[PDB]
Structure formats: structure tokens, C-alpha cells
């Protein structure tokens, strides 16, 4: 149906601004949202359609300690939207309490936008894990929606914070955030800072403004994942039809992504498939096996090569996945995009559930457990002191992520016939 | 040509996904008159988003047998009638075969409806972290996967490769033969052929078993384990019959490759 | 039929003067009451029609200690009316006794105006609760009309005095006044000072001349509630047809109001409905549930959206009302007004019986009971001493408002099937 976008936090509002500029340049519209005559499309999912065809986006903007939100405010794309929804620490409990006191009027903003929609499919939020102001607040509003609406979906695109370890309560905050993510969300798409750092240092030579190019890559991914919605396809034009195959189980619902060019400034279906089989073309860093993989391709493809390719892909066994049961790769095609120069013609996007990401969770678990053994790294800030006097929510989150990692490590096994 | 592709072969998005979806809300002592279905069609034509043409008009939608009778079987015939100098090319026998494949592709959409129905009944009570909840959810994943591979097969053969051999088929006499081969290579790869009649024959048993699976929520675990074991028995025989029908076809070669991948 | 207006007290004559200036500017007439050629309407309910079309209002003016009544007297709207009816403390018993001695000639003024009318529908009075000169006197004339005419209706628009507590006998006076209001009146429309203070501080930045803007909002409300009378509608063009649905019960006959713009210097039926669902767009400040709600809308409405809206209004359950029985919202349409600039096109007015106002009564009850326990707050003024030597009318009023609050709290219950 219709999908409502949400954005909060400094990194989330940055990537949302980049996503809307991406879809502004991508389709034939003005930076005030007037349709271009020279351009057909559906933009009714993420944009409300007006009478002069002002495709005003379904983007609710929440801010706390605004600095870059001011730069979003005075912009030549500030005529695209004005839904009148902008409403004003670096701790999880701080952002949790700040969202707690204003939950009513932001819920009025939610219900107003819900009344703006006739039907609904899902909520996306722009969020970053352990982002400071975003952390805790995002978990709180996730709790609010999960309490309020069990009839809809939530998709979440968020990055894993790694700054190569002044902030030492960051593993605690990310742990509590991911606890709410496993239990109160239905599907998670997670990425790494380090893998995008690798691809950025390979494709280019920039080190300091890396955030900006990260925003570009996030925008390309978020357009790619939505192309079968925005360009009219004929299958999985609901989100739940896309999500249904990849997630059999309500705790292992974390999805990793890839995209075939590292630098984007013929390719055949065989080439782009085997490139997409690499972890260096995947933007997330015993043998680990996928449960299921999905691929969507967009470009100038020849339809007869593709059956040749998946024949030979069976034959070489260039993937190694065996959960326990008959769940394999799903390949799909979307339209090569007009209204932009189509260079690097064929490009693919890849979506899988793989057990290896548990190791990265385990790395964070190893850090947090170490700090939990010392118990000197909450720094006795007053916010976490009010919200839990005994700090037992950290132990509850520890036992939940223990269940999660154990479910992961059992999910590797070909005896996962039971407990799936 | 590229209009009948969208409707008679259900290639447009949010048209089949709105027509069949409104149809399945009704199902029966209803659907007994052609004044409810022909307005449901008028509601689906609005949300097609592409079309809205006189080629998207003059469609005739009828049920050759009216329902006067585990059942998954339901018929529906969608046709488009063309003017007189083009009727000699697009005959009324080719459109009838288009309706014949229309009914089967319609009967596929009932499955992604009904499995979603039992998923949605379970969704509103998603509470208990026990073994009985997760073990149930696994059967749904197993049954959804085979649907998601058989639709991807249909969404390779009848709409992509037989459409690849139609944009390079075109040459007044040759145009009639070009349409007549477009239909023939579709019905060959559609496995409506009498050579491949058993493999199409087991698919109805698959459909009826997942409907009986859908009927219950809870009533009892053991009946669901039994229905799921019947599903697994039939799927175990399918992999043997599909390799046997290549020991005696290139389009059939991909089916066994699809249903088995990095397993046996 | 025809409705006779009454006005008394400083706040009542202020809001009556503002109401008549409102209907002077609203319809096409002169400030001496000559019809404008450039202007059709009925003004026969609240104005007697003359031969040069002088619509002389049915407004009887009573004054006591006049200061602002003198400013009403020398005015460019003093040629609109002259019915020759102007006839001369801050206590309830004082105003009661002063009305008591002159009840005959003011009753002659009443009967003269009654003979001026051919038929009659109701009496409105402009009054303020605990207004000093208005208080007690207004209860006395309410007793006089309730004794005299059981064939007519009384509608009353009066405010609830809250000055954020020198005058300490004010809860006693307001209590006695509301006692006469529950037992001798048929329908009451009450408002708050604090809710209008909130809306005024939100829409504007004024604090000291708040009375003047309060008068403007009262005039807009009183025009809105009368628009289906003054502009020719076709249903509930009698007052009793409007009043009949909201009041099932003769003690719970208190009606609260709302109005969609807070600032008035598209909107759809969905938007204005959900705005009107807020208590911040309502000018009056366990779960409480309405008995019945009525809405009248005036603007540029599209007639097919309105059935869509009340479908979805059922679906979201954005109201919570369940008295015990099948009494729901009533939505109606009146004409968007010509002869004035129609900006803020669609505007709604809202009329309900809700049990929450009992709490506000209870607040006053909590104050009065506290003062009644101390018994030092009548200040031994001689007026209340003559009128009741034993002060047992206060205890009778206390038991009556106890019955009223108990009827309210039982009226919340879904076992109100009996005693309704």
C-alpha cells in the first residue's frame, strides 16, 4: 500500500535529506515539487500527490539539539515539503526520557499523517545505532508504534557504529537499542561503517568527508530497494511480499546488502552475480551459510543468459549455503532507470539472511561483557540512574542477546529442523 | 498485443493484485450474477495505473460454470474482443487459450492469499515464546517457499522468454502465424501439454492440502503435523518425477534446478 | 419561533454589545439599522423588523452601578436599538434583593416585549457566574421566568470564574447560582476563563486586555450557534430541536463547545473533525465519555468526503464515548457566510454533553466545602444575613450539587440503563 517514512537523529535526518534529494533528481520533478513536462511513474507511496502535482513526501521530521536540521531548514528543497511537524543528550536514557515526555504530541503528528493516508503498508525510520540523540529516542518510538499498531510493518535501515576503539557507554546504548530491535521490530537492514570505509577508500581517496559519500551510497541503496515500488513492477510491490521469504523466524530478521559497482563513475549476469557473491561487494563486513538470498537486477539484460547463469551457478557451487532446508536464492528484474545517464548499465542489489553477522554482534557482546565485568563505564550519568536504579535491564538485554546468538549458532546447523 | 499481455496474462501490477484480492473477500451463495463481478472489474481498472484505454475497455468477464456445487478450484474467463479487420489475426480461439491460462494463474493468487490469511491470523497473536509457536511458524515458511519458487518459474517462462521470441518474430500472412506461435510456445512452456500432465496433476493436491492447513489456527498441533507430512511426501515425489521427465526438455530442465539448490 | 434576548451584568452587557456589533457587521445593515441596498436573510428571530427595515434587536437592558453601560449608551449603535427598558453590590444576596424589589416593573418590561412578539421560542440571557452585580440577580430573574412561563425554553451562555486563587464568598455565590441553574433552567452552555486564556495566549501575545478578545470569541461562537437560524436552514430551526438530542436528563443539561481555528487571521472534513476532537480546540478545560456530540460545519465542503470521514472516524476510534446506549455524534452543515471575507474557509462548531465538566464542578465543590468547614468566608455581610439567618440554603445547595456530581459519576457508567 502506502509507506510512511520517519526520520530522527543527526545521521538519520542526513540520510533522509540525501534520499529525498536522490528521488528529486531521479524522477522528473522540480525542487519545489512541480512535475516537469519533459518526463510514467508512481510516486504515491513515499509522496502525497497534489493538484499542481506537488509530491510532498511522507517524511515526519523530529529534531533534538538542531544544528544540521537548521541547514535542512533553509534549502531549495524546503519548498518540496512543509508538513508542519518539526518539534524539538547523547545518552540512551536521555533520548528515551525526552521522547517519553513529548510522546503525545508526536503521536498526534503520527495520527495526523495516518489520516493523511487512505491505506498503509509500513513505516520506515531513518536512524543510526548509538547516534546519541537518536539512540534511546528511536527505541522509545519503536515501542510506541509496536504498542499502537500490530497491523503494519516496520523496516529499518541503520548502521553499526565502529569508530575503532571518550564515549564508553556506547556498547550499553547499542545493546539496549538492538534489544528493542530484535523484540519490537519485524525486519532489520543493518550496515557497517568499516565496510563502507573499505569501499570508499577503494573507489576514492577521501578520508575526512566520508559521511557525505556514505550518504550517497545509502541513497543509491534506498532507491534500489524501492525501485520495484517507484517504477511500476508486477511482483512484490508490497513490502511484506519482499520481506516474507527472507525471514522465517522472529529474532533472526537481520538483512545484509550488496551492490555490484564499487566505483560507478558488457557486464553480464554471470559477472554481476559472482561480484555480488563477494563480501567486498557487500557493505557489511565454523563455516557460515545463508538461510536465503534475494537479488534484484536493473539494467540492460538479455533474458536468455540468466537461465544459463543460474545453471552454471549451481554447477560451480560458488555460494555455500545450507540452513537445513530448501531455501535458495531469488533473482528478480527491475527497470533500468530513465531520466538519468544510464552508465554502468547493469547493476544488481542483493538481500540475504546470513548467520555471519552474529559474529559482529558477538564482537560488541565481547566488548559490553568486558565493560560489564568491570562496571565503570556507565560513568554514573543520572539519566540511566533514574530509568533503572538496579541496572537490571542491561542483564535482561544480555540474556536476550545470548538467546539471539544461540539462535544464530543453532541456525547454522542442519539440525535446525526443530526450533526454527 | 502489449495490452492483452497486461490483463489476460496479469502482467500489470496492482491490477491482478486488486482484482483477485477483491474476488477472494467474497468466497458460495454469492458471485451468482454478472453484476457484482463486472463492477469489481471496474474497480480494479481504476487502480491499474497503466492503461485506461479503449484497449483496456470492451473486456468480457464471465464464468462458464456458475458455482452450484478442500476446494481451491474456481474458473473465470477474461476476453477482449477486437474489430473486424484485426479479428482475422486475433481469433476467438487464441483468446480462449489466453483465458485458459488466465484461470490457472488466477488460481495461483488464491495461495498467496490464503497462506497470508493463516499468517495474518497468527500475526495478531504473535505473547508465547514457546516451542509450539516457533514450530508452527516453520511449517508456514516451508509452504511459502514452494509457492515463491513456482511463481518465479511461471514469471520466467510464460512472460519473459516466450516474449523474447515475439519481439523478434514479427516480419500480412506472417503476422497471423507470429501470433499463433506466441500462443503455442506459451502453452508448450506452460506445461499444459499432455506429455507433462502428471507434474501438473500433483499441483492440485498441493493446493488442497495447504487449504486444509489454512482451515485451522488452537484446534490441535497433530493434525497440522500430519498435513505438513503429506505436503513433504508429495514434494519428495515431485523431485523424482521432474528428473524422470528429462531422462525421457530445456524448459523443464530449470524446474528441478529451481526446486533443489544446495540440498537434495 | 421568535427568541427574546436578555442582558444584565457587566460581562453580560459587554458580550451582548459585542454580539450585536457582530451581527451588525455580519449582515448587510447600517449602525442605525437601515438595510444596505448592496446585500437574502431572516433577521426576524433576534430583531424586530421595521418599515424602513430597522431591525431593532430583542434586547432588554438591565443595569446596576453603570459604568460600561454608559459607554454602551453613547455609541453609533445606539440608533440600532431604543426599546426604552434601561432601569437601575457584588454579592449574591445583594443582587437578589435588588432584583426582588423591582421585579414588578421589570416584569412589565418582560410582558411588554412578550406582547411585542407574536409567538415565542426561548429566552437567552447574557450572564456571568459570580460576576458581582449579575450574580444573585440573574438567579432571581431565572426564578421569576421559571415561575411565570413553563411553555418556553431558556438557553444560557455563561463563563466559569477562575482568577487563580480578596473576594472569598465567590464559591458560595457561584454555588447558589449553579443550584438555580440546575433546577430552574433547561439547558446550559458553560465556558472557562482558563481555556480561553490558553487559546488567547497561543493565538496572540496579549495578557492584559484579554476581556476584549474573549468578547470576540464569544461573538463568533454565538453567531455560529445561531447561523442555522439567521441564515435559512431546513432542520433544527427551532431551538428545542437542537437541544433535544443532547440532554436526556434534567440535571445533566450542561453543554460544552469547540471551534476549529484557534487563530483565524485546504482544510478537509477529516482535519477539522480531528481538530475538533481535541480539548485544546474546546473552550472548556477514570475515563470520561460523552453522552452525545453535535457538530455543525460552515464552509466550502465537498459532500462526498463527509461519508468517507465518518467511516474512518468509526475505524480509528479517535473518540471515546459510551454512556450506556446508542447516542452518537450528529454532524450538520450550514451556509458559509457571505458579506464578509471568507478566509479560513471551512470552520466547525461542536456541542456535546461530556461528564468531565463534573470534575471542574468538583474543584469548586472542593473549595466551597473547605471554606464551609472553616466558616469564616461569608465575611458576615448583612445581605446574606437577612436572606437566610441560618444559612441552610448553602447546605441545601450542597446536597443538590452532591446529587448532581453523583448523577454525573453514575452517568459515566454503562449501567446507567436505570436512573437516567
Task: Transcribe C46-112 into DSSP letters.
Answer: SEE--TT---EE-EEEB-SS-SHHHHHHSSTTTTT---S--B---SHHHHHHHHHHTHHHHHHHHHH
Distance CA B170, CA B158 (A): 18
Say if CB C48 and CB C56 are below 8 A apart: yes
Closest-CA distance, A418 to chain B, in angstroms, reads: 7
Max CA separation in chain A (angstroms): 65
Give the torsion sign (CA, B176, B178, B180, B183).
negative
Distance CA B150, CA B142 (A): 13
Distances (CA, A) of B184 to B9, B156, B178, B181: 15, 16, 10, 5
Query: Nearest-5° angle of CA B161, CA B162, CA B165?
Result: 90
Q: Which residues contact A42 (CB under 8 A, 6 or more apart)?
A: A229, A230, A231, A232, B49
Distance CA C221, CA C287 (A): 28
Distance CA B159, CA B10 (A): 10
3-state secondary structure chain B: CCCHHHHCCCCCCCCHHHHHHHHHHHCCCCCCCCCCHHHHHHHHHHCCCCCCCCCCCCEEEECCCCCCCCCCCCCCEEEECCCHHHHCCCCCCHHHHHHHHHHHHHHHHHHHHHHHHHHHHHHCCCCCCCHHHHHHHHHHHHHHHHHHHHHHHHHHHHHHHHHHHHHCCCCCHHHHHHHHHHHHHHHHHCCCCHHHHHHHHHHHHHHHHHHHHHHCCCCCHHHHHHHHHHHHHHHHHHHHHHHHHHHCCHHHHHHHHHHCCCCC
- Which one-letter DSSP state was computed for residue C281? S
| First vs last C-alpha separation in chain A | 30
| Most A CBs within 10 Å, among B126, B132, B141, to test the A interface | B141
Cβ-count burial of A100 within 10 angstroms (0-12 exposed, 13-18 middle, 19+ buried)?
middle
Say if CB B45 and CB B51 are below 8 A apart: yes
**Helical residues (DSSP H) of C170-285, grouped into ranges:** 170-184, 193-203, 210-225, 227-230, 239-243, 269-276
Say if CB A110 and CB A75 are below 8 A apart: no
Closest CA to A11 of A127, A153, A172: A127
Chains with 3+ CB–CB pairs under 8 A to C are: A
Distance CA C123, CA C6 (A): 7
Annotated ligand binding at A50? The verdict is no
Q: Which residues contact A50 (CB under 8 A, 6 or more apart)?
A: A33, A56
Distance CA B99, CA A52 (A): 41
Closest CA to A148 of A4, A299, A344: A4
Distance CA C293, CA C286 (A): 20
The length of chain A in residues reads 420
Q: Which residues contact C193 (CB under 8 A, 6 or more apart)?
A: C159, C160, C161, C162, C163, C214
Distance CA B124, CA A152 (A): 11
3-state secondary structure (DSSP) of residue C4:
strand
CA nearest C318 in A: which residue? A111
Say if CB C224 and CB C298 are below 8 A apart: yes
CB atoms closer than 10 angstroms to residue C161: 20
Query: Nearest-5° angle of CA C143, CA C149, CA C151?
Result: 135
Strand partners, C349: C259, C296
A311 interaction partners in chain B (CB closer than 8 Å): 253-254, 257
Distance CA A415, CA A411 (A): 8
Say if CB C316 and CB A120 are below 8 A apart: no
The length of chain B in residues reads 264
Strand partners, C192: C160
Nearest CB among A244, A311, A327 relative to B257 is that of A311
Give the torsion sign (CA, A311, A315, A321, A327).
positive
Q: How many CA atoms lie within 13 A of C8 on its CB side?
A: 30
Beta strand pairing call for B77-80 and B59-62: antiparallel
Q: Gaps after which residues in chain B, C–N over 2.5 Å?
A: 27, 69, 126, 171, 217, 248
| Most B CBs within 10 Å, among A146, A153, A234, A246, to test the B interface | A234
Strand partners, B78: B61
CB atoms closer than 10 angstroms to residue C38: 6
Q: Is A312 on the interface with B (CB under 8 A)?
A: no
- Which one-letter DSSP state was computed for residue C29? B
Say if CB A137 and CB A89 are below 8 A apart: no
CA nearest B147 in A: which residue? A245
3-state secondary structure chain A: CCEEEEECCHHHHHHHHHHHHHHHHHCCECCCCCECCCCCCCCCCCEECCCCCCCEECEEEECCCCCHHHHHHCCCCCCCCCCCCCECCCCHHHHHHHHHHCHHHHHHHHHHHHHHCCCCCEEEEECCCCCCCCCCHHHHHHHHHHHHCCCCEEEEEEEECCCCCCCCCHHHHHHHHHHHHHHHCCEEEEEEHHHHHHHHHHHCCCCCCHHHHHHHHHHHHHHHHHHHHHCCCCCCCCHHHHHCCCCCCCCCCEEEEEECCCCCCCCCHHHHHHHHCCCCCECCCCCCCEEEEEEEEECCCCCCHHHHHHHHHHHHCCCCCCCCCCCCCEEEEECCCCCCCCCCCCEEEEEEEECCHHHHHHHHHHHHHHHHHHCCCCCCCHHHHHHCCCCHHHHHHHHHHHHHHHHHHHHCCCCCCCCC
Q: Which residues contact A210 (CB under 8 A, 6 or more apart)?
A: A196, A197, A200
3-state secondary structure (DSSP) of residue C262:
coil
CA nearest C309 in A: which residue? A115
Say if CB C257 and CB C189 are below 8 A apart: yes
Long-range Cβ contacts of C167-171 (<8 Å, 24+ apart)? C167/C90, C168/C371, C168/C377, C168/C379, C169/C91, C169/C92, C169/C377, C169/C378, C169/C379, C169/C381, C169/C384, C170/C130, C171/C364, C171/C367, C171/C368, C171/C371, C171/C377
Q: Is A112 on the interface with C (CB under 8 A)?
A: yes
Q: Do A326 and B145 touch (CB under 8 A)?
A: yes
Q: Do C270 and A112 touch (CB under 8 A)?
A: no
Q: Nearest 5°: phi and psi at B77?
A: -120, 115
Q: Nearest 5°: phi and psi at C189?
A: -110, 115
Q: Is A115 on the interface with C (CB under 8 A)?
A: yes
3-state secondary structure (DSSP) of residue C226:
coil
Say if CB C335 and CB C231 are below 8 A apart: yes
The two counts, helices (H) then strands (E), for chain C are 15, 11
User: What kind and span of H or E run contains C26?
Assistant: helix C10-26
Long-range Cβ contacts of A160-167 (<8 Å, 24+ apart)? A160/A129, A160/A190, A160/A191, A160/A192, A160/A193, A160/A284, A160/A360, A161/A128, A161/A129, A161/A130, A161/A131, A161/A193, A162/A192, A162/A193, A162/A194, A163/A193, A165/A367, A167/A90
Distance CA A293, CA A320 (A): 11
Strand partners, C124: C5, C155
Q: How was this structure determined?
A: cryo-EM
User: What kind and span of H or E run contains C391?
Assistant: none
Distance CA B204, CA B107 (A): 10
3-state secondary structure (DSSP) of residue C150:
coil
Annotated ligand binding at A132? The verdict is yes
Say if CB C156 and CB C239 are below 8 A apart: no
Q: Gaps after which residues in chain A, C–N over 2.5 Å?
A: 39, 88, 165, 265, 285
Q: Do B261 and A322 touch (CB under 8 A)?
A: no
| Most A CBs within 10 Å, among C202, C263, C274, C276, to test the A interface | C274
Distances (CA, A) of A285 to A84, A127, A413: 40, 20, 22
Q: C-alpha A124: how far from its chain's center?
A: 8
CB atoms closer than 10 angstroms to residue A264: 13
Say if CB A284 and CB A254 are below 8 A apart: no
3-state secondary structure (DSSP) of residue C387:
helix
User: What kind and span of H or E run contains C236?
Assistant: none
3-state secondary structure (DSSP) of residue C354:
strand
CB atoms closer than 10 angstroms to residue B99: 20
Distance CA A33, CA A81 (A): 8
Distance CA C190, CA B207 (A): 66
Q: Nearest 5°: phi and psi at A197?
A: -65, -40
Strand partners, B198: none
Distance CA C412, CA C355 (A): 7
User: What kind and span of H or E run contains C357?
Assistant: helix C357-374
Strand partners, C398: none
Distance CA A298, CA A224 (A): 9
Long-range Cβ contacts of C46-49 (<8 Å, 24+ apart)? C46/C3, C46/C5, C46/C226, C46/C230, C48/C116
Q: Is C270 on the interface with A (CB under 8 A)?
A: yes
Cβ-count burial of A161 within 10 angstroms (0-12 exposed, 13-18 middle, 19+ buried)?
buried
Distance CA A191, CA A183 (A): 19
**Stated resolution in angstroms:** 7.6
Distance CA A97, CA A95 (A): 5
B114 interaction partners in chain A (CB closer than 8 Å): none
Q: Order across the sheet with C59-61: list the strands.
A: C59-61, C3-7, C122-126, C153-160, C187-192, C254-259, C347-354, C290-298, C330-334
Query: Nearest-5° angle of CA A205, CA A208, CA A209?
Result: 90
Annotated ligand binding at C337? The verdict is no
Distances (CA, A) of B196 to B9, B193, C77, C125: 21, 5, 97, 90
Distance CA C174, CA C360 (A): 13
Distances (CA, A) of B228 to A238, A419, B137: 27, 16, 12
3-state secondary structure (DSSP) of residue C331:
strand
Q: C-alpha A239: how far from its chain's center?
A: 13
Q: Which residues contact C34 (CB under 8 A, 6 or more apart)?
A: C52, C53, C54
Long-range Cβ contacts of A207-212 (<8 Å, 24+ apart)? A211/A11, A211/A14
3-state secondary structure (DSSP) of residue C127:
coil
Distance CA B125, CA B143 (A): 20
Say if CB C197 and CB C210 are below 8 A apart: yes
Amino acid at each position: 500500500r502506502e509507506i510512511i517514512t520517519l526520520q530522527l537523529g543527526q545521521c538519520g535526518n542526513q540520510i533522509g535529506f540525501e534520499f529525498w534529494k536522490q528521488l528529486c533528481a531521479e524522477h522528473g520533478i522540480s525542487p519545489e515539487g512541480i512535475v516537469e513536462e519533459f518526463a510514467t511513474d508512481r510516486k504515491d507511496v513515499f509522496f502525497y500527490q497534489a493538484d499542481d502535482e506537488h509530491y510532498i513526501p511522507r517524511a515526519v521530521l523530529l529534531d533534538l539539539e538542531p544544528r544540521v536540521i537548521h541547514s535542512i531548514l533553509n534549502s531549495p528543497y524546503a519548498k518540496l515539503y512543509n508538513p508542519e511537524n518539526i518539534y524539538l543528550g547523547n545518552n540512551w536514557a536521555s533520548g528515551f526520557s525526552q521522547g517519553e515526555k513529548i510522546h503525545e504530541d508526536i503521536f498526534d503528528i503520527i495520527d495526523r499523517e495516518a489520516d493523511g493516508s487512505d491505506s498503509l503498508e509500513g513505516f520506515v525510520l531513518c536512524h543510526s545505532i548509538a547516534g546519541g540523540t537518536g539512540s534511546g529516542l528511536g527505541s522509545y518510538l519503536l515501542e510506541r508504534l509496536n504498542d499502537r499498531y500490530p497491523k503494519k510493518l516496520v523496516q529499518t535501515y541503520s548502521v553499526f557504529p565502529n569508530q575503532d576503539e571518550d564515549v564508553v557507554v556506547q556498547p550499553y546504548n547499542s545493546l539496549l537499542t538492538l534489544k528493542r530491535l530484535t523484540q519490537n521490530a519485524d525486519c532489520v537492514v543493518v550496515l557497517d561503517n568499516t565496510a563502507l570505509n573499505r569501499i570508499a577508500t577503494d573507489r576514492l581517496h577521501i578520508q575526512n568527508p566520508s559521511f557525505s559519500q556514505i550518504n550517497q551510497l545509502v541513497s543509491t541503496i534506498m532507491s534500489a530497494s524501492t525501485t520495484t515500488l517507484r517504477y511500476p513492477g508486477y511482483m512484490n510491490n508490497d513490502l511484506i511480499g519482499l520481506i516474507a521469504s527472507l525471514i522465517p523466524t522472529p529474532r533472526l530478521h537481520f538483512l545484509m546488502t550488496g551492490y555490484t559497482p564499487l566505483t560507478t563513475d558488457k557486464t553480464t549476469v554471470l559477472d554481476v552475480m559472482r561480484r555480488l557473491l563477494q563480501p567486498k561487494n557487500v557493505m557489511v563486513s565454523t563455516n557460515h551459510c545463508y538461510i536465503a538470498i534475494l537479488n534484484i537486477i536493473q539494467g540492460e539484460v538479455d533474458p536468455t543468459q540468466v537461465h544459463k547463469s543460474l545453471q552454471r551457478i549451481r554447477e560451480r557451487k560458488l555460494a555455500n549455503f545450507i540452513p537445513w532446508g530448501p531455501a535458495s536464492i531469488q533473482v528478480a528484474l527491475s527497470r533500468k532507470s530513465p531520466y538519468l545517464p544510464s552508465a554502468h548499465r547493469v547493476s544488481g542489489l542483493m538481500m540475504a539472511n546470513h548467520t555471519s553477522i552474529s559474529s559482529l554482534f558477538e564482537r560488541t557482546c565481547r566488548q559490553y561483557d568486558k565493560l560489564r565485568k568491570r562496571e565503570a563505564f556507565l560513568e554514573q550519568f543520572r539519566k540511566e540512574d533514574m530509568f533503572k536504579d538496579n541496572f537490571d535491564e542491561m542483564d535482561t538485554s544480555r540474556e536476550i542477546v545470548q538467546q539471539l546468538i544461540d539462535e544464530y549458532h543453532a541456525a547454522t546447523r542442519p539440525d535446525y529442523i526443530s526450533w526454527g | 498485443y502489449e495490452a492483452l499481455r497486461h490483463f489476460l496474462l496479469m502482467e500489470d501490477g496492482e491490477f491482478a493484485q486488486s482484482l483477485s484480492d477483491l474476488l477472494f473477500e467474497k468466497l458460495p451463495g454469492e458471485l451468482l450474477n454478472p453484476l457484482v463481478l463486472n463492477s469489481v472489474l471496474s474497480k480494479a481498472l481504476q487502480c491499474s495505473l497503466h492503461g485506461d484505454t479503449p484497449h483496456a475497455s470492451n473486456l468480457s468477464l464471465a464464468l462458464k460454470y456458475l458455482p452450484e456445487v478442500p476446494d481451491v478450484l474456481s474458473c473465470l474467463e477474461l476476453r477482449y474482443k477486437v474489430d473486424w479487420p484485426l479479428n482475422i489475426v486475433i481469433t476467438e480461439g487464441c483468446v480462449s487459450k489466453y483465458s485458459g491460462v488466465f484461470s490457472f494463474l488466477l488460481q495461483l493468487k488464491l495461495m498467496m492469499w490464503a497462506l497470508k490469511d493463516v499468517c495474518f491470523h497468527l500475526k495478531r497473536t504473535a505473547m508465547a515464546g514457546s516451542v509450539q509457536f516457533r514450530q508452527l511458524q516453520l511449517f508456514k515458511h516451508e509452504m511459502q517457499h514452494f509457492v515463491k519458487v513456482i511463481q518465479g518459474y511461471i514469471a520466467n517462462q510464460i512472460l519473459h522468454v516466450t516474449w523474447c521470441e515475439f519481439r523478434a518474430r514479427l516480419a500480412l500472412e506472417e503476422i497471423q502465424r507470429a501470433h499463433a506461435e506466441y500462443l503455442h510456445k506459451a502453452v508448450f512452456r506452460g506445461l499444459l501439454t499432455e506429455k507433462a500432465a502428471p507434474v501438473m496433476n500433483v499441483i492440485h493436491s498441493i493446493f488442497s492440502l495447504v487449504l486444509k492447513f489454512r482451515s485451522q489456527l488452537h484446534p490441535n498441533f497433530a493434525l497440522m503435523q500430519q498435513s505438513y507430512n503429506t505436503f513433504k511426501y508429495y514434494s519428495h515425489f515431485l523431485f523424482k518425477v521432474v528428473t524422470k521427465l528429462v531422462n525421457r526438455q530445456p524448459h523443464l530442465e530449470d524446474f528441478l534446478l529451481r526446486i533443489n539448490f544446495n540440498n537434495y
